[PDB]
Design an enzyme around this catalytic site. Sequence first.
Site, short mmCIF file in Angstrom:
data_model
loop_
_atom_site.label_atom_id
_atom_site.label_comp_id
_atom_site.label_asym_id
_atom_site.label_seq_id
_atom_site.Cartn_x
_atom_site.Cartn_y
_atom_site.Cartn_z
N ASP A 25 0.66 -1.21 -0.13
CA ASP A 25 0.07 0.07 0.11
C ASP A 25 0.75 1.39 -0.04
OD1 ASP A 25 -1.74 1.98 0.10
OD2 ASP A 25 -2.77 1.14 2.18
N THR A 26 1.00 1.99 -1.24
CA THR A 26 1.76 2.97 -1.14
C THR A 26 1.18 4.30 -0.52
OG1 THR A 26 0.85 3.74 -3.46
CG2 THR A 26 2.82 2.29 -3.19
N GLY A 27 -0.18 4.19 -0.40
CA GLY A 27 -1.01 5.00 0.37
C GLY A 27 -0.98 5.28 1.83
C1 LIG Z 1 -2.14 6.96 6.05
C2 LIG Z 1 -1.43 6.01 6.85
C3 LIG Z 1 -0.51 6.21 7.98
C4 LIG Z 1 -0.10 5.33 8.86
C5 LIG Z 1 -0.51 4.14 8.61
C6 LIG Z 1 -1.30 3.51 7.37
C7 LIG Z 1 -1.63 2.21 7.41
C8 LIG Z 1 -1.82 4.37 6.89
O1 LIG Z 1 -2.73 4.13 5.88
C9 LIG Z 1 -3.96 3.98 6.19
C10 LIG Z 1 -5.19 3.76 5.08
O2 LIG Z 1 -6.03 3.64 5.49
N1 LIG Z 1 -4.72 4.02 4.14
C11 LIG Z 1 -5.71 4.15 2.82
C12 LIG Z 1 -5.55 5.61 2.14
C13 LIG Z 1 -5.84 6.91 3.03
C14 LIG Z 1 -4.61 7.60 3.34
C15 LIG Z 1 -4.84 8.71 4.10
C16 LIG Z 1 -6.06 8.93 4.88
C17 LIG Z 1 -7.14 8.10 4.64
C18 LIG Z 1 -7.06 6.83 3.49
C19 LIG Z 1 -5.28 3.09 1.98
O3 LIG Z 1 -3.97 3.56 1.40
C20 LIG Z 1 -5.59 1.80 2.41
C21 LIG Z 1 -6.74 1.34 2.77
C22 LIG Z 1 -6.96 -0.23 2.91
C23 LIG Z 1 -8.16 -0.77 3.25
C24 LIG Z 1 -8.69 -0.73 4.53
C25 LIG Z 1 -9.99 -1.45 4.76
C26 LIG Z 1 -10.51 -2.10 3.88
C27 LIG Z 1 -10.23 -2.13 2.02
C28 LIG Z 1 -8.85 -1.37 2.13
N2 LIG Z 1 -7.99 1.54 1.48
C29 LIG Z 1 -8.96 2.20 1.69
O4 LIG Z 1 -9.31 2.65 3.04
C30 LIG Z 1 -9.69 2.48 0.34
C31 LIG Z 1 -10.42 3.68 0.12
C32 LIG Z 1 -9.24 4.91 0.08
C33 LIG Z 1 -11.23 3.94 -1.01
N3 LIG Z 1 -10.86 1.34 0.22
C34 LIG Z 1 -11.94 1.35 1.29
C35 LIG Z 1 -13.17 0.74 0.59
C36 LIG Z 1 -13.03 -0.35 0.22
N4 LIG Z 1 -11.71 -0.46 -0.54
C37 LIG Z 1 -10.64 0.34 -0.74
O5 LIG Z 1 -9.58 -0.01 -1.47
#
Ligand SMILES: Cc1cccc(C)c1OCC(=O)N[C@@H](Cc1ccccc1)[C@@H](O)C[C@H](Cc1ccccc1)NC(=O)[C@H](C(C)C)N1CCCNC1=O
Lengths: 99, 99
Positions: A25-27
Site C-alpha cells: 500500500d503506497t497510500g
Molecule cells: C495513512 C496511513 C498512515 C499510517 C499507517 C497507515 C496504514 C496509513 O494508511 C491507512 C489507510 O487507511 N490508507 C488508505 C489511504 C488513506 C490515506 C490517508 C487517509 C485516509 C486514507 C489506503 O492506502 C489503504 C486502505 C486499505 C483498506 C482498508 C480497509 C478495507 C479495504 C482497504 N484503503 C481504503 O481505505 C480504500 C479507500 C481509500 C477507497 N478502500 C476503502 C473501501 C474498500 N476498498 C478500498 O480500497
Amino acid sequence: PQITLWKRPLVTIKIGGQLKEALLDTGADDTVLEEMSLPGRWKPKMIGGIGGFIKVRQYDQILIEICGHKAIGTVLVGPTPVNIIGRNLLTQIGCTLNF
Amino acid sequence: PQITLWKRPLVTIKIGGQLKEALLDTGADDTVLEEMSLPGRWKPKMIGGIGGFIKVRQYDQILIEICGHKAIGTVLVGPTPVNIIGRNLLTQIGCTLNF
Ligand SMILES: Cc1cccc(C)c1OCC(=O)N[C@@H](Cc1ccccc1)[C@@H](O)C[C@H](Cc1ccccc1)NC(=O)[C@H](C(C)C)N1CCCNC1=O
Ligand SMILES: [Cl-]
Ligand SMILES: [Cl-]
Ligand SMILES: [Cl-]
Ligand SMILES: [Cl-]
C-alpha cells in the site's frame, strides 16, 4: 517482481513464523497488521484512514518477510480491516511506483 | 517516472478544470476526492476502511489527467481526509509496483 494493479496487490508475508496475506500500500505511511502477538514492548500510535483515526500498538525492530524479501522494521498492530504493508517497509524492500 | 516511497507519492492531477494534489494509492480500489463539483449523474455509495465508513457520490466516466497521463473512470467525491488516486485510474496510466 513487477506488479500490475488490475487486482489488489496482495502478497504473502511471513511474521513470527506465520504466513499472512497483506496489501502492498503506497497510500500508507506505516505498516499495520490485524491483531496478533509480537515480542517486546510497544508504544501508542494513532493512524488515520478513510473513516477516521484508530489506536494501534507500535512494535519496533520486528523481523518480517514480504514476498520473500527480508525486512526489519516497525510494525503496527490493531483493528485494521486488512493487513497493510506501508511505505516504511516498501522502501526497505526497494519498491517504487513506475509509469 | 519512477517514484520512490521515502515520502508520500503525491502528484498533481487535473480534473473538472481544476489542479489538485492527490496520493497515488495502490491500497485503494477506488479514486476518492475531497468535496468538489463534477458534471453528470451520480449515485450515493458507502466506502469503509480504517476508522469506519463515509458516504460519497459516485460519478462515472470522468476525465482526469495524472502526471500528464490522461484517463477516464469512476471518481468518488466526499469527506476523504486526502485526495486519493486508486487502482481504477492507476491501471489506466500504466502504473506498476516494482522491486
Ligand atoms: C495513512 C496511513 C498512515 C499510517 C499507517 C497507515 C496504514 C496509513 O494508511 C491507512 C489507510 O487507511 N490508507 C488508505 C489511504 C488513506 C490515506 C490517508 C487517509 C485516509 C486514507 C489506503 O492506502 C489503504 C486502505 C486499505 C483498506 C482498508 C480497509 C478495507 C479495504 C482497504 N484503503 C481504503 O481505505 C480504500 C479507500 C481509500 C477507497 N478502500 C476503502 C473501501 C474498500 N476498498 C478500498 O480500497
Ligand atoms: Cl493485476
Ligand atoms: Cl521501519
Ligand atoms: Cl473506473
Ligand atoms: Cl497493463
